[PDB]
Design a binder for this molecule. Structure first.
Ligand SMILES: O=[N+]([O-])c1ccc(O)c(O)c1
Ligand SMILES: O=[N+]([O-])c1ccc(O)c(O)c1
Ligand SMILES: [Zn+2]
Ligand SMILES: [Zn+2]
Ligand SMILES: [Zn+2]
Ligand SMILES: [Zn+2]
Lengths: 360, 360
């Protein structure tokens, strides 16, 4: 059975289980079951499923080199699909809540969930909470008797926590750290001293690399009972490296990819985000360029946004991206080589992950 | 050591552990650690700790009748305190998010967290997510080697899920179920046909009784390794009965308790909530009273709110409350008697819980 079709079949199965359990154990009525079904479909479906399918692909790699009964192969692949959906539902939680937090308008060419006429923020915040709860409900049901249950739940909650910490790093990245204070309304930085590579790297590491790359890779190992087959420190290093590249590409697209292609209007400049573009620009700018950036960044005024995009264009940041890209290619190939010492199979799965990311 | 002082000492310990771990494993800086410390204190402290202290009191009851080394007594009580704080932090999550969802202004005489000048909704939604994550971080750290870890985490996530489902039941309780639809803006009911005792009971059961009574009672049993000492179906029944009474009292106070005493301005009438008052009023009203209720309920207009409160006053609902109260006293005393068959000690702990609730 083709992997994507298996993955989609398991979505339907998990959805039916969750809604049936709501009827049999939580007294739900058919109309609220329908609302939650539509909520699940709208918030969890329609992406590329890169994260969930990484779990499946990692598990497929180990099946090709490991002796198993056919029923065991089917169990492992089903487990990989359920685990992949746990990650997709975790992402769905964060996208629902982040879109509310950020006042976002569209996602993937459609309105953000909270903007649906019959949803509203009052419902959508709680819908996002339900999405997160569903990750645990499906784990306890499908993995109840599994040897990896404890490790998988512990990993999942650490990654969830890392992601929330990273969200804090992101939403505070345009303020001066020493002025953070719940009692005092937060001004945007004026010196941009905290727009540095190391501070940028911390935001990205926590807000997206743990749930986008580390969690799918390690979940694939766990459902395969293969974690002792790899050097975990290398798994972490390569997950954080590929994940940073993924976010850098996202940052570039926010500014330069046409909205029809991007699926939304990017507002990182108006929002004063600590983006790869801003950090790289400030790392190469002269005094006059820095002053012009300061006079225009973080402002809704379209003329000021246009000034910032021209500064980026004139600074030839596409060439800095090519140099960054070349160094990532070099470092990821090195880590893949090291992963071969203990597992050529897992190294190949990571090579596939990188190629997909690189060619996005 | 007095129970409350132990409980507060464990708060300080858990807080220090969480913040130290953020520094050593999540790359946090001192200013963001300070923000999160203040967030934790502001959102988790200042209530009565009824829920957390129930865990401790249940465990204390079993210690009095069970043979243990002194070090084991100390371990059990420390575990009970950590488990109690898990429940308090879970509540804190829901109060932060519910206050945002509902546009609430005050809680306990102070501004809701999202309204702090240096917080804002953008940060507060994520702060609430962190509060929930902390419940799991503290469980995995303190209970890693404990025999009850699996049962405790499974129970906790079921109760968390029930609570979110109950929040859905609550925030949709003024709409007609058959018209729920993410695509269509939701009108308030005009017939109030779903303002019934059974529908009210479902809201309350899920939105507050699981986390306010069932979870603290069962967590106390789990940390005491005493769950086989009780009839779990009776624990559930008595938790749901006491928890309903607790919410009925809250509903009455929303309407009739002065804001200075209540800690907020109650708006259940303007919000068109399915409250015990509205359900009881509609269960005894004549046609003219029903029509007057319909013409005034769910409206911000203070004159219309005043009409509704007068309808309630003239309907002598205080007497319906006394009758409801008398039946609850009768039913709770019956369940306590049944709990004595297997555990007089646990029955007494439940009797204490009821007395505290009744005399609130
Ligand atoms: O962007 N990609 O290609 C991705 C993103 C996340 C992944 O886990 C992955 O394996 C590929
Ligand atoms: O209101 N009370 O007194 C309460 C509320 C919750 C509890 O778990 C409790 O033991 C007492
Ligand atoms: Zn965001
Ligand atoms: Zn972006
Ligand atoms: Zn509410
Ligand atoms: Zn209330």
């Amino acid at each position: 059975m083709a992997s994507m079709e298996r993955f989609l079949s398991v979505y339907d199965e998990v959805q039916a289980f969750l809604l049936d359990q709501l009827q049999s154990k939580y007294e739900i009525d058919p109309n609220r079951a329908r609302y939650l079904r539509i909520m699940m479909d709208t918030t969890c479906l329609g992406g590329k499923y890169f994260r969930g399918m990484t779990v499946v692909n990692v598990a497929e790699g180990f099946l090709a080199v490991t002796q198993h009964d056919e029923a065991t192969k089917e169990r492992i692949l089903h487990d990989a699909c359920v685990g992949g959906w746990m990650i997709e539902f975790l992402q769905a939680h964060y996208l629902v809540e982040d879109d509310i937090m950020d006042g976002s308008v569209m996602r993937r060419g459609k309105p953000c969930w909270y903007r649906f006429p019959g949803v509203t923020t009052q419902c959508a915040i709680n819908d996002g909470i339900i999405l997160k709860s569903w990750t645990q409900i499906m784990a306890w049901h499908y993995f109840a008797d599994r040897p990896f249950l404890k490790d998988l739940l512990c990993l999942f909650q650490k990654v969830d926590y890392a992601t929330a910490v990273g969200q804090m790093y992101d939403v505070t990245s345009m303020c001066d750290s020493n002025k953070l204070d719940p009692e005092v309304a937060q001004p945007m930085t004026t010196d941009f001293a905290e727009f540095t590579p190391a501070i940028y790297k911390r935001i990205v590491k926590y807000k997206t690399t743990f749930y986008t790359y580390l969690l799918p890779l390690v979940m694939g190992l766990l459902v395969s009972e293969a974690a002792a087959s790899v050097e975990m420190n290398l798994v972490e290093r390569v997950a954080h490296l590929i994940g940073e590249y993924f976010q850098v590409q996202d940052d570039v697209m926010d500014c330069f990819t046409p909205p029809e292609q991007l699926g939304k209007v990017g507002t990182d400049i108006e929002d004063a985000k600590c983006s790869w573009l801003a950090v790289t620009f400030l790392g190469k700018a002269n005094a006059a360029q820095v002053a012009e950036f300061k006079a225009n960044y973080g402002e809704k005024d379209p003329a000021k946004v246009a000034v910032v995009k021209r500064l980026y264009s004139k600074a030839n940041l596409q060439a800095d991206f090519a140099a960054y890209e070349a160094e990532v290619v070099r470092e990821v190939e090195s880590l893949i080589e090291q992963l071969k010492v203990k597992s050529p199979t897992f190294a190949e799965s990571v090579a596939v992950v990188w190629e997909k990311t690189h060619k996005r």
